[model samples]
Target: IPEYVDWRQKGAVTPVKNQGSCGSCWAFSAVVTIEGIIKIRTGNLNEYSEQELLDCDRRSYGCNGGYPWSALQLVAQYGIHYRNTYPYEGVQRYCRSREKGPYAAKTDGVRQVQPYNEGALLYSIANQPVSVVLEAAGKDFQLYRGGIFVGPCGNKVDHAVAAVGYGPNYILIKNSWGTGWGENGYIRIKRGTGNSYGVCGLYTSSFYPVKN
Candidate 1:
């Protein structure tokens, strides 16, 4: 394998998104994973709906935080809509009647990358962007500018994000904090550390969707 690989550079990553004051990072992360799958499978880059997951996925909390796996389940079951069809409001909203209208895309199901396995994560990213959850409580993470975050982080796992690619020394991650945060809504964390879990528990809880 090469020392580095970046899906963003290969045109797999979508634009940055903002969850606003909502704790709906799980939806954003899941949408990113879905979009990546769609792009890879169909060669089209469509912004799927976080609002669909937020409103329709009853299995998880809307804006009070949730799990990416749960959101993926809803994507597999109800399918998903495009952002234009059901745009994001950054807050909790009713799952309107428009849900039954039509879907822009759907997933066959999702696959969970083996936990504590960076090799699996790297292979997944090489194939498609992955949905990952990690610790984001540190001040350094909150104000991260650029460079591989060798943080002072732990395995608390409080926020969800996406792994877009990998480099010789870092994993390229896409965040939902908007473009003003990090390196235009992305972060690089220490990679190839031989610590199976990677930095900030990145490989601890990772998953990705399979387009239908």
Candidate 2:
């Protein structure tokens, strides 16, 4: 890998989002992955609506938590709308942008890094931002203020986040929580664990949207 990489500084990232009290981290994660991929491909970083996913993606649970892959599938079928046009509400509102237009981004489908495989996960992050999962309920995670999070946490994989950058032994991820938490809404996790679950199982569920 390069000495360091960060899509936010490189202009391939969007604003850090807040998912509120809802269990919409997966929606937030999918939007980040898709937006970063679209920006990398098109040279324009645009914000896609997670509200659209929360409302329209029928296969997944809305506010009660879901998967980024499910949201990716929905994006493949219906191009994602701009957040400015269809902003986030943190709840399962009516699905209004299904057939609507003036969309900002599109993805062909979802792509997954080989589960429990560190090599593919690193390669994926080096190329672009990816969606990843981890257990975020521990005191270490909840009390996080800044710095790389080598959590004394579990491997339950209950929350989704965006892996936006990385360094030699750390992977930087953007969280759905507001900026008041965790290094201005971002955290780096310990990378390259030989056990393969990664720090908090971040490598176990790495994924991204395909630009094609």
Candidate 3:
């Protein structure tokens, strides 16, 4: 899918924050995604609490990191909490015990779905409202060079994020690399973007009822 606005030239460079060894990219994605969604959903620009999701949503494997599917599953199981409830700092925090069993909330949450191809993903972006996926090495993004980044960084699951919305031929991805980089901490993929991810397809999340 071709992008309506080619932000490649106008996009800003951003700072990359390290989540340390904590597998909490979902935290970053969760926060960043909600940040965009709130703005789009309500026209209110506010950052959500990644820390709250990291700690309270223990099922997502915060310390060990997690998949976009897991994040969506948690959201489906337990409605997303407001930022004030948890507050976000992008660090590993103590996991909170749950009052109820996993995913007991009866709300129509962003379902946890993973796509197997570019077509499915594009359709998801157009219809699913939001998505979360993983990526390997990024040629367009600049590194922050901090404690958050260590060792030889290759194409790996070192980051996490969400696809809040998309246009006719673009995928709008909200990143956790802070608001100092990559089109204000986000990546835009040509619609129908696809690649090999890992054990599963190279993608992490996709919307249901995705069009062809």
Candidate 4:
């Protein structure tokens, strides 16, 4: 096992995903977060395709945007399949009705955490490596490319991303905005703050320890 990068911040680092403007941010949240859990569980980067969930997963809003809980529910219903079964091509795609069925998946297995705030999120992440949560939406955030986004971004539920890793004061995130945007589609959210943008209290992945 590699010396797993222990992020002291609020989130953990995750693998790469080429989100192709599919409006599947919600699915991305589910996929990327699951990717982390599966990685920790099996120690492999399976590269699960978020676009597949976007195209399929009738339960989720798909592309239009949705919630983190809804994505989780999908997993609870139909587990995530191996990435090889759904390799991502960085483009928006939909899943056929037949494709939706009893599948295998792994979860963070986190029932609950403490503080119910940023501190809790950080604590949960410290124990693991990946975290999932809801992201605010609005005109300000609609065009947000990179940099630390503050509360002024409307604080609406329109997007979802993964908290890859973090530091004492900043947490790194892997955005679904593709690798061409914001520090290669990665942003560092400031921690120790009272805003939801940096430490939005959402669901995170449970350690599943696996091999890549």
Candidate 5:
């Protein structure tokens, strides 16, 4: 693999956001992954709506926890709106009809990184941001302030983030906990540790969007 890759420097990654007490991280991760591809395709970094998925994606649970895999499928079928057009409420409410505009974004399909192949995960990050899962239920993780975290985590993945880049032995992740936590809503987790799952089981369940 290449020595390092980071999509943020390429103007693809969006500003970090907060899911608050809501279990809508699945929404954010899926949306961000697709958002990155939109930029990669058209050279325009458009922030899509997590609120649209939080409200409209019937395939997955809204705020009470959901899966990014299924949420992305819905995005592929029905294009999502812009963050400003939809706006996050951090609460699960009834679905609202969204107005369509150039501000919206969609993917042709969803793709999964090969399970147990961290190399493929890294390879995918080299091209675009990916939706990744990790065990963030750990107190050490949630309370993390900054620095390259060598996780005090496990395999029971309860949180999701966008794998926006990687550098040397670390994978850069964008979390949904706002700027108050970990490098202004970002984390550099240990990579190439040879665990197959990588740090916090991130490599095990990872996905990305495809646009043409």
Candidate 6:
């Protein structure tokens, strides 16, 4: 792999967000991926709606938990409103009908990286941010403040996040736990270990949106 690449420095990564006490990491991750690709495709960084998925994606649980894959499917089918239009409530709510407002962002499709393929994941991140699931059920991860997180995680893939870029030995991840967590709501996980899963099972369920 190349020495390092950061989508944030390239101006594709969006501002960090908070999921509150709700189980909406899935929505956040999906939105981040869509936001990145939309920016890359159109040269415009617009915040898409996560509440759209949280409230409307019938394929997965809303605040109780959800899947970014299912959320992507919903976006593909129904399209999504801008965050300013739909906003985020951090709780389960009924889906709002589409309304006329600020421009809405829609995706043409989504592409999934092959499971257990870190090289593919990294390559996709070079093009745009990737949505991924990680096992973050550890105190070390929950309380992580800075530095490349080398441990204190697992492979169960309990939490969904966005892979923004990579460094010589770490993959950069954007979290939904707000800016106060990790490195300004981002984390660096050990990379290039030759393990397909990379750190914290990040390579398992990775995907990116396709803007047409």
**By the lDDT metric, which is better: model 2 or model 3?**
2
Q: Model 6, 1-212: lDDT tens per residue?
A: 56789888878877999999999999999999888888888888888888888998888888889889888877877788888888898888887845535337777787889989877888888888889888999888898989988776778889999888888788899999999999988999988778777677878888888877
Candidate 2 lDDT score relative to the true structure: 0.86
Q: List model 3 lDDT by residue over 1-212, tens digit each.
A: 44332222222112234454566776666554444434444444544445656776656776777655555455545555555555455666675424422421222345445544555555544433354554535543345322222213233544566555555544566565556656655655444423444211225444321111
Which 10-residue window in model 6 sums to the lowest lDDT? 97-106
Tens digit of per-residue lDDT, candidate 1, span 111-186: 9999998888888888888999889999988989988899888878899999988887888999999999988889
RMSD of each: 1.4, 1.3, 7.5, 5.5, 1.6, 1.5
Give one digit per residue, the lDDT tens place, for model 5 in 40-131. 88988887888878888787778788889888887787778888888899887777644445436667888898987878888898988899
**lDDT values, one for every candidate:** 0.86, 0.86, 0.48, 0.55, 0.84, 0.85
lDDT of 4: 0.55
Q: After superposition, how far is residue 204 of candidate 3 from its true place, in Å?
A: 5.1
In model 1, what is the error at residue 182, expressed in angstroms? 1.0
User: For candidate 4, lDDT tens digit of each residue in 31-85?
Assistant: 6666666655565555665655665666666556655555665565555666666
Report how far residue 212 has shifted in candidate 5, in Å: 0.8
Question: lDDT score of model 5?
Answer: 0.84
